[PDB]
Amino acid sequence: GTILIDLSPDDKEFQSVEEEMQSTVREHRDGGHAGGIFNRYNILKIQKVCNKKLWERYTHRRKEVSEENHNHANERMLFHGSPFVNAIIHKGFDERHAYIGGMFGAGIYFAENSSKSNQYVYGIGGGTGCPVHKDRSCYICHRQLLFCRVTLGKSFLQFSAMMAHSPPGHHSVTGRPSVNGLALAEYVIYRGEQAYPEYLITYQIMRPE
Numbered sequence: 001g002t003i004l005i006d007l008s009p010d011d012k013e014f015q016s017v018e019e020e021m022q023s024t025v026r027e028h029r030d031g032g033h034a035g036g037i038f039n040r041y042n043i044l045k046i047q048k049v050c051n052k053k054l055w056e057r058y059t060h061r062r063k064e065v066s067e068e069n070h071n072h073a074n075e076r077m078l079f080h081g082s083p084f085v086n087a088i089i090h091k092g093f094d095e096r097h098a099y100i101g102g103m104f105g106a107g108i109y110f111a112e113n114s115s116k117s118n119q120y121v122y123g124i125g126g127g128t129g130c131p132v133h134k135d136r137s138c139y140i141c142h143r144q145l146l147f148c149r150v151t152l153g154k155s156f157l158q159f160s161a162m163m164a165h166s167p168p169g170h171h172s173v174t175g176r177p178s179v180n181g182l183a184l185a186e187y188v189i190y191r192g193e194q195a196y197p198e199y200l201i202t203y204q205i206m207r208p209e
């Protein structure tokens with residue numbers, strides 16, 4: 001029951017999502033190995049993901065978390081990159097979309113930095129890059145990221161150089177960077193119902209001039 005609605009580039013909603021995508025690019029400690037070498041994107045399309053059942057699944061869980069946390073869902077908008085983007089938008093997040101080997105355990109991982117999520121669009125470590133050219137830094141092939149509504153609730157703070165259950169008494173984990181002063185936070189949820197894939201963003205990475 002998913003439909004995708006194209007946003008016009010003239011729409012304020014398109015512009016605000018594009019700005020979050022572009023403004024949260026950073027350099028990565030791998031020199032571009034996983035996600036490619038780029039400072040910005042060419043945004044090709046932004047689509048709203050509409051699914052009544054998945055939205056109601058999300059809001060139901062959000063209310064449960066809010067009620068366990070002094071009426072505070074602690075809702076964020078965060079990026080997610082995955083080879084399973086097309087499954088996620090149709091069936092929702094679940095255990096199959098977890099990063100089993102993630103540093104905060106087997107859960108579903110999200111980033112404040114769009115460029116962090118870009119490292120996972122072709123798999124863990126960028127896999128073998130794009131299917132057409134086998135290039136993790138492909139400037140031709142179209143990539144997709146999700147910009148997701150995520151319920152964190154009470155989040156367990158992990159200081160770090162950067163499914164399972166949430167730590168007891170918590171609804172998520174926050175990976176705070178403790179080495180790279182430019183990195184933004186990363187977050188992990190352990191219930192697929194705590195995220196909704198609100199925007200599907202189609203883009204290319206751009207070769208630096």
Ligand SMILES: CC(C)Oc1ccc(-c2nc3ccccc3c(=O)[nH]2)cc1
Pocket residue numbers: 079080081082083097098099100109110111116117118120123124186
């Ligand atoms: C089958 C593999 C690719 O499952 C994964 C799917 C998504 C991710 C993923 N991990 C992240 C870790 C930190 C910050 C962001 C992400 C992310 O966007 N996706 C990891 C594994």
Ligand SMILES: [Zn+2]
Pocket residue numbers: 130131132133134135138139140141
């Ligand atoms: Zn390619």
